[PDB]
Amino acid sequence: VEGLRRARYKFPGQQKIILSKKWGFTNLDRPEYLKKREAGEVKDDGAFVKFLSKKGSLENNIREFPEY
Amino acid sequence: QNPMRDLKIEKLVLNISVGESGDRLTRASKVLEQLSGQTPVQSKARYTVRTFGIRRNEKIAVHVTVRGPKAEEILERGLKVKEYQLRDRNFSATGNFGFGIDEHIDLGFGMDFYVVMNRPGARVTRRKRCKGTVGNSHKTTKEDTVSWFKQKYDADVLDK
Amino acid sequence: KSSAYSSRFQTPFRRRREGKTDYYQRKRLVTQHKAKYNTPKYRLVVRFTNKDIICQIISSTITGDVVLAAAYSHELPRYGITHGLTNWAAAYATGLLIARRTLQKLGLDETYKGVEEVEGEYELTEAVEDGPRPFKVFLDIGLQRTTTGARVFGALKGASDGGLYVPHSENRFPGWDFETEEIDPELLRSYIFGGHVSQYMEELADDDEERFSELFKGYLADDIDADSLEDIYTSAHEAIRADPAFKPTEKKFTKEQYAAESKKYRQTKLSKEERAARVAAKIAALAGQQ
Amino acid sequence: GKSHGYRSRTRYMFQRDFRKHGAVHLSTYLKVYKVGDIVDIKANGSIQKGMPHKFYQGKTGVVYNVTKSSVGVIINKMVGNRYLEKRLNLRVEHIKHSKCRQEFLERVKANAAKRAEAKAQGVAVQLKRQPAQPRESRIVSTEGNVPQTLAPVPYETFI
Amino acid sequence: PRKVLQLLRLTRINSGTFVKVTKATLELLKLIEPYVAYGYPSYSTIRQL
RNA sequence: GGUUGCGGCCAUAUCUACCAGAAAGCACCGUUUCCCGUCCGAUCAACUGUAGUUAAGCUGGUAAGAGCCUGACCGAGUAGUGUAGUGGGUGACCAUACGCGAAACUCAGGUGCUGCAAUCU
RNA sequence: GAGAACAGAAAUCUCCAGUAGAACAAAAGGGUAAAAGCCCCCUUGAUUUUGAUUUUCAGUGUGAAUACAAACCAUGAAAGU
RNA sequence: AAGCUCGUAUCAGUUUUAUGAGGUAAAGCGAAUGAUUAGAGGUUCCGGGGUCUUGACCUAUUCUCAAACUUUAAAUAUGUAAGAAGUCCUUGUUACUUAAUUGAACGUGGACAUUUGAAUGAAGAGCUUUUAGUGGGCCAUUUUUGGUAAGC
Ligand SMILES: [Mg+2]
Ligand SMILES: [Mg+2]
Ligand SMILES: [Mg+2]
Ligand SMILES: [Mg+2]
Ligand SMILES: [Mg+2]
Ligand SMILES: [Mg+2]
């Protein structure tokens, strides 16, 4: 927070610092993300993750996310 | 199920690639007339490269196509030089295969022999009306033609 | 095939995907002069399948094409032709049949009797003064290639000789040589009575008897020799000009009986509940630690 | 300098619709047009002959002439402070029947049917359309539909 | 809005007219809203006018 | 209901991978004297329906399939926008009043219909 | 993409995939797949007479373009163009 | 300015209902084209150092964009229609058109009156001749181009 506060002096105009309620850089809320990962619907792909959907062929959705 | 899907020779093509044109070219095309019994045709160069010595529409190469039972006979003549030995390569992923030789007096200028495999019912792809596509089970595979080449001529496949 | 490829793909017309209709040709065949309003243009459709020939008179409508008259080569046995249902002589007879069937239906049978002295001459059905003009149709060959000696022009000859005005030229009839711009009536007359087949029988029998029997097996069984198919072809033309009216084959079974038997060999769709059942069962098997 | 060619500024107007390129379907050529018919103009970009100018795109006119592969259409164009009559020769690919009046024909038919039905016994057939009228009184029951109270919600970021 | 006021015979300030309420006249009132004041008149108001 | 010829709308019809198909039809398939066309009777032309085969074409079904189509107070009355004030704010811009009103997203369902003629357990 | 003596990243031959990612004298934008692209065959309608119409517009001219009428022709089995 | 033909016929800088046209605002990039950040899993007889790393494409994801990009797509503006020059029944003309008394166009005769075909309004509507001045403009709200900006 202090690091972003010091960056505001370099910019014109008004900026605001907001504490996000998401989990990291994902578009999911923290409780929602915890719900999916405990169900084995989250796979680590590099620095980001991929999710398991209810669509598509089961032949591909089974080898991916074997725990589910 | 193999009631009718037997591998068959569709066509055999005798391709002679010559760098230049003129007296040299007609000398090479002269052999194909007596080698296959049919007059060949000449293919012009697509464009100019200025490095291989060819220019656009220069009539560099000659080829001829032969089918029927008069083609499997000369196919045998082309395999005696090869001694019924072929590499694991030379077999296309679509079921075709080919090989080349360096001299023509041995059969009875280098030449290239390429054989196209098919099955009965391939007319659906070639016919004008209601043109279709051959199904997957009816297609020719590399493993199918290699086995077919093993059964007849009692030939063998080289390493790998 | 990427998802983007399928999304931006434009499918052709169904009759073009199947490969049966040339829409470039169809547009010019059916488009009518707008100052003629609802005047229909009639197409003489000639089609050749294996061991069958189809001839139709068709006009176009928004809801779909409309058939005026039809003629099939499998009806030729009633007129005395049982063999060669797809050769040149069959096409001429089928073309002659459709011309007579259409004129009688329209009530114009008495006028435009065609030519009863066929000798391979190139002529057109001219109009009669102070009376109705002849019925006019345009030849529709579809995807057939235009070559001199093709059977589709043989069916054209029969329709024209039957009393229907069909505009055409003689440069696609057999007996036409490119060097000299004239038609040979003698060679053309041979083809109308199966001369090319009768000639084949005599030459093949004296060359290879084994080949003759296998090919012309039906002629031998029915006691038909090489110089008798012309006589039956002449009698068939006489029979066509007598009772060309179409009759339907008697149906042994009705539509309901036909439908009931065919339904037993048809596979039915599945409801949403059983489709959901199949995937649920697969999960319990593949994703259930066996 | 400026550019004011015949097809200027028609980059998007004359384009084909998405996944709708190729030849024209046959129903365009099978329709019949008569003098006095009401048609609307929409150019097809794949037929370069007999194509209207960009001004007449989206306009409606009356047929006055019928030819082999085209019709003549009359359009009223506003020039200055008045209207001038314009006559267009357009191929049938660029026009279609207008439904701005085809729907009016059935109202004429229904008016005659209603007039004859009430002719023997009824007076004041009332064959005139009327605009939407204010709603009449009604009674709203709360049986199983007890009103639910709502309140404004506080401000939240949820970014 | 100037045209709509003329069609309602409101050509000077403090002029008034009655309007029957339909879909065709409700849209007219929307166009001239910042120029007029209107409402629902009672029997007493109509009688005295 | 099956199938063939000619169609209408032109993916609910396409694409990928599999499975099944009685009858007839369609097709593959046989042949090179004749008309005809090729370097090659492969394509195209002609002849036979005879010698063979449902292997393919073709039709149907299968897939928490891709695409496509339809609907949903799913998102959202959100973005945007017409009109109004001597409204806010240094400004950038923003709120309110009377109206109109998206797209993506999410979820659910669907997977050609049909006209003319002929024919078939 | 997978193959064939010399032959190589580029010579010629074969198959598969391929909604146009090519080509269409030129600037750019439209349009086009049994074609408007490529190859082959035949041709001179790039012809004759004189009006109407669209665009710029004063509803003048000029340029260009559209649809017919009366002739004479080209091409194709033909509808047609 | 001079009037003329007529006396509410018909019209409207407006709404409504029915039916068209458009590619701007917005939106979109795990949709085409063109830009653009970061990893991850795969691929070589087809890049190069080294016996294993960096590049190059392939596939599935991820951050951010377009006056001369786009599937989708408003609001405001915009074309036409809402009857007597209309609808229906019968049948006359032609050298055009049809295989054909088929069609096309124009007519004879009969049937249907102004809740006669939505709303509102209408110091009346239509029409003609003639001629003055003017052809340096400027400002405000909203949209908007060049320019750091300007009472530009
Ligand atoms: Mg053609
Ligand atoms: Mg031109
Ligand atoms: Mg004000
Ligand atoms: Mg624009
Ligand atoms: Mg924008
Ligand atoms: Mg001055």
Author numbering:
A (entry chain LN): 149 to 216
B (entry chain LO): 6 to 113, 123 to 174
C (entry chain LI): 8 to 297
D (entry chain QT): 2 to 160
E (entry chain LK): 99 to 147
Cite, word for word, the article reporting this structure.
In this study, we investigated the expression pattern, structure within the ribosome and effect on protein synthesis of the ribosomal protein paralog 39L (RPL39L). As obtaining pure populations of RPL39L ribosomes from mice remains challenging, to analyze the impact of RPL39/RPL39L on ribosome structure we turned to the yeast, which has only the RPL39 gene. We complemented RPL39-deficient yeast cells with either mouse RPL39 or RPL39L, and analyzed purified RPL39 and RPL39L ribosomes. Ribosomal particles from the WT yeast strain Sc60S, the yeast RPL39 KO strain rpl39Δ, yeast rescue strain rpl39Δ-ScRPL39 and the mouse RPL39/RPL39L-complemented RPL39 KO strains rpl39Δ-MmRPL39 and rpl39Δ-MmRPL39L were studied by single-particle cryo-EM.
